[PDB]
Amino acid sequence: MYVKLISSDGHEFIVKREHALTSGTIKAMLSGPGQFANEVNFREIPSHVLSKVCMYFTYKVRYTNSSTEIPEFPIAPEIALELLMAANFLDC
Amino acid sequence: IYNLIHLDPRTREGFTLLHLAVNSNTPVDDFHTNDVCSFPNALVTKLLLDCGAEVNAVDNEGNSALHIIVQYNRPISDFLTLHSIIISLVEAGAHTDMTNKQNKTPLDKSTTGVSEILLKTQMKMSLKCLAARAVRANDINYQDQIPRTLEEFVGFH
Amino acid sequence: MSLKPRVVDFDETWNKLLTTIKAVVMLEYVERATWNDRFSDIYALCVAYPEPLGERLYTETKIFLENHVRHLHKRVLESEEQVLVMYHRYWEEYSKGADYMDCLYRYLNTQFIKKNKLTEADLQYGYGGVDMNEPLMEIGELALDMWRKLMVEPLQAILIRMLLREIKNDRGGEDPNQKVIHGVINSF
Amino acid sequence: MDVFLMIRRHKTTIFTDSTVFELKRIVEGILKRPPDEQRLYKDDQLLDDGKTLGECGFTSQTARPQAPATVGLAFRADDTFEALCIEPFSSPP
Amino acid sequence: SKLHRMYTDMSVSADLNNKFNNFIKLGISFQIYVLQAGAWPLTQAPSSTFAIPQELEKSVQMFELFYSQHFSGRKLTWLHYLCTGEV
Ligand SMILES: [Zn+2]
């Protein structure tokens, strides 16, 4: 029910798996012999951007076709390019 | 119909089959304007999409077959047709937010009230698009830093 | 950042990739950390700083699959009258291998193949095609289409003849293994 | 209850969405460690077990979907959990 | 013409009821109608705002919860004086 994400920095983030399955790439990575039983490690992603990605997961989870205005997702200026890069490899 | 959409039928200003089909069909006359060939009809566009016309066909003003729909003047007239055509257009992966020249989000160019809301019922939030808008908000170098494919993607935003 | 376009050896990367690929297709256990590490080499190849290299990788994977299917065809056609029980083994292996392989090439499928893929619409009503080329297809599509092209066509008459013969044996009352025959028929 | 909360141990982060003892039981179930051994230090201040959400003094304005409330947890160190900090994440260059 | 739109109402009402279960996938037995206000001769707007019982409010909140998604731009009208239930 809970899945572990390990960044290249070394920090480990535990997340509800129903949240994590939003991104197709993670779903495909779990599929296959690596059934892991879970924990997942990325050799190149730094911790902070992956934390922002996790916050994106939970923020999308909170509001789905929800009524009224949806609060915008704050973006830091420098990390914008890194987020654009990291969008592909997770395909969220 | 398929052999015709395969060659580019593009007119002088840049319109294609879809763009003519969706907007107001001005040259209807001599009993074509009567009892037949109602402009902004749905079945013709459905057939055209089924035959395999390009959905997000670029326009010289970048109306992109979506900014045309919102500028429909009276929405109550043939309202169900507008709902069906929006459902069909969001089908087959038409990017919702597409800006050419000055930033023309279809939400902004839309000025018909409830129709706007209909588009809001169909948008899907993606981290890629949102981040692309955020980086577009600033002025950041994106030449040779990112992979080739996303240059055209960041460029779209 | 290690997600920036860069220059790496195609040959050296393929050497390391093939070792994992061969173990995967044979349903043999592979280390999960190795699987996760290999999953990034695909992106590293698909975005190379000088020029993209997906085209060569496509044909390389194709030729590897063809070599393996040729070996399997040799082994199967070597045995005579034991094909019934042999068919199920390597069909079971190859199907799971193809599914996992299709899972593993997800980025290549999503960002490369679909752009040059033939739209299903023109394959149906449009027609419009007569070139002497094989258009780019899905990895699983390659696997299955190739498997039909290179193995079942040469070795179909004797298989169907023995299946029909076994049907008479069942009509006699005796019941052979229903699972094997059912899987063979379902393979079609 | 509908509170965006985070737990930060050294090389460990927990995301979760009405008393402190309930959260201690939840994290016990997550990590299989006794709840009394663990403890919470909000702004380097121990939180008594059973402290309900209302008296925590932080509501939706603090617990945000994009900016969840961050909470430091002193995991048990020998007898009790004190002086435990998470290593800060790498900052962009 | 007015008679023609009478018959379509039931088919519309059934479709509006058949398309009411998707996104949910109460403690009471709930069977209700969704009418086309533009067709039925029920133009008597309720002059009194009847406070819905709290037991039925959960279904009412459930009712307006899903009507937005697959019926976009459509506004609901509650005719409580016509709705009935078993106690
Ligand atoms: Zn976008």
From Swiss-Prot, chain A:
Overexpressed in prostate cancer cell line PC-3 and breast cancer cell line SK-BR-3. Its main location: nucleus. One of its GO terms (biological process) is transcription initiation at RNA polymerase II promoter. InterPro entries: ELC1, SKP1-like, SKP1/BTB/POZ_sf, Skp1_comp_POZ. SMART domains: Skp1. Gene3D superfamilies: Potassium Channel Kv1.1, Chain A. Ubiquitinated by the DCX(AMBRA1) complex, leading to its degradation by the proteasome. Pfam families: Skp1_POZ. One of its GO terms (molecular function) is protein-macromolecule adaptor activity. Heterotrimer of an A (ELOA, ELOA2 or ELOA3P), ELOB and ELOC subunit. The elongin BC complex interacts with EPOP; leading to recruit the elongin BC complex to Polycomb group (PcG) target genes, thereby restricting excessive activity of the PRC2/EED-EZH2 complex. This is Elongin-C.
UniProtKB/Swiss-Prot annotation, chain B:
It is found in: Cytoplasm; Nucleus. Widely expressed. Highly expressed in testis. Weakly expressed in other tissues. ANK repeats lie at residues 13-57, 61-98. Signal peptide: none annotated. Belongs to the fem-1 family. Component of a CRL2 E3 ubiquitin-protein ligase complex, also named ECS (Elongin BC-CUL2/5-SOCS-box protein) complex, composed of CUL2, Elongin BC (ELOB and ELOC), RBX1 and substrate-specific adapter FEM1B. Homooligomer. Interacts with PPM1F and PHTF1. Interacts with the death domain of FAS/TNFRSF6 and TNFRSF1A. Interacts with CHEK1. Interacts with NKX3-1. Substrate-recognition component of a Cul2-RING (CRL2) E3 ubiquitin-protein ligase complex of the DesCEND (destruction via C-end degrons) pathway, which recognizes a C-degron located at the extreme C terminus of target proteins, leading to their ubiquitination and degradation. The C-degron recognized by the DesCEND pathway is usually a motif of less than ten residues and can be present in full-length proteins, truncated proteins or proteolytically cleaved forms. This is Protein fem-1 homolog B. The gene is FEM1B. The chain holds residues 471 to 627 of 627 of the full protein.
UniProtKB/Swiss-Prot annotation, chain C:
Component of multiple Cul2-RING (CRL2) E3 ubiquitin-protein ligase complexes consisting of CUL2, Elongin BC (ELOB and ELOC), RBX1 and a variable substrate-specific adapter; this complex is also known as ECS (Elongin BC-CUL2/5-SOCS-box protein) complex and may consist of CUL2 or CUL5. Component of a ECS(VHL) or CBC(VHL) complex containing CUL2, RBX1, ELOB, ELOC and VHL. Component of the ECS(MED8) complex with the probable substrate recognition component MED8. This is Cullin-2. It comes from the Eukaryota. Disulfide bonds: none annotated. Core component of multiple cullin-RING-based ECS (ElonginB/C-CUL2/5-SOCS-box protein) E3 ubiquitin-protein ligase complexes, which mediate the ubiquitination of target proteins. CUL2 serves as a rigid scaffold in the complex and may contribute to catalysis through positioning of the substrate and the E2 ubiquitin-conjugating enzyme. The E3 ubiquitin-protein ligase activity of the complex is dependent on the neddylation of the cullin subunit and is inhibited by the association of the deneddylated cullin subunit with TIP120A/CAND1. The gene is CUL2. It comes from Homo sapiens. The Cullin neddylation domain restrains the RING domain of RBX1 in the E3 ubiquitin-protein ligase complex; this restraint is removed upon neddylation of the cullin. Belongs to the cullin family. It is found in: Nucleus.
Swiss-Prot record, chain D:
It is found in: Nucleus. It comes from the Eukaryota. One of its GO terms (cellular component) is cytosol. The keyword Translocase does not apply. Keywords: Acetylation, Host-virus interaction, Nucleus, Phosphoprotein, Transcription, Transcription regulation, Ubl conjugation pathway. Its main location: nucleus. Residues 1-62 form the Ubiquitin-like domain. The modification Phosphothreonine is found at T80. SIII, also known as elongin, is a general transcription elongation factor that increases the RNA polymerase II transcription elongation past template-encoded arresting sites. Subunit A is transcriptionally active and its transcription activity is strongly enhanced by binding to the dimeric complex of the SIII regulatory subunits B and C (elongin BC complex). Belongs to the Elongin B family. This is Elongin-B. The gene is ELOB. The chain holds residues 1 to 97 of 118 of the full protein.
